[PDB]
């Protein structure tokens, strides 16, 4: 084939590898912020379940 095919497939390969590179760097930035601040969907560490708190009137009033 002519030189155009290899030349333009290289650009296609370059675009993919470049975009994977920036996606790889961005994930590490996201993970760092999510783990330090706990404000994202990841690194959500468990806390006690509130559905097992008893809310009934107790034997004594001041509870």
């Amino acid at each position: 084939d002519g030189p155009e095919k290899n030349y333009e497939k290289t650009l296609a390969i370059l675009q993919i590898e470049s975009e994977k590179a920036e996606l790889r760097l961005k994930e590490q930035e996201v993970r760092r912020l999510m783990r330090a601040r706990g404000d994202g969907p990841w690194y959500q560490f468990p806390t006690p379940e509130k559905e097992f708190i008893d809310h009934s009137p107790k034997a004594t009033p001041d509870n």
Binding site: I16, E19, K20, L23, R24, G40, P41, Q44
Partner: protein
């Protein structure tokens, strides 16, 4: 004219009427912290696959 209550009667839960207002925050609790914002939208495939080193897919 005092009639002695029967067995079981004094242990009943009863309703009482009161002009006292209902306390609104009896525990004096603070405002709860706001939940994390939820991310919305439909799922798409991972962009360029797994992106694990040299694996293409």
């Amino acid at each position: 004219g005092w009639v002695r209550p029967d067995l079981g009667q004094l242990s009943k839960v009863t309703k009482v009427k009161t002009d006292r207002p209902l306390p609104e925050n009896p525990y004096h609790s603070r405002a709860r912290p706001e939940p994390n914002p939820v991310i919305e939208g439909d799922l798409k495939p991972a962009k360029h696959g797994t992106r694990f080193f040299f694996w293409t897919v």
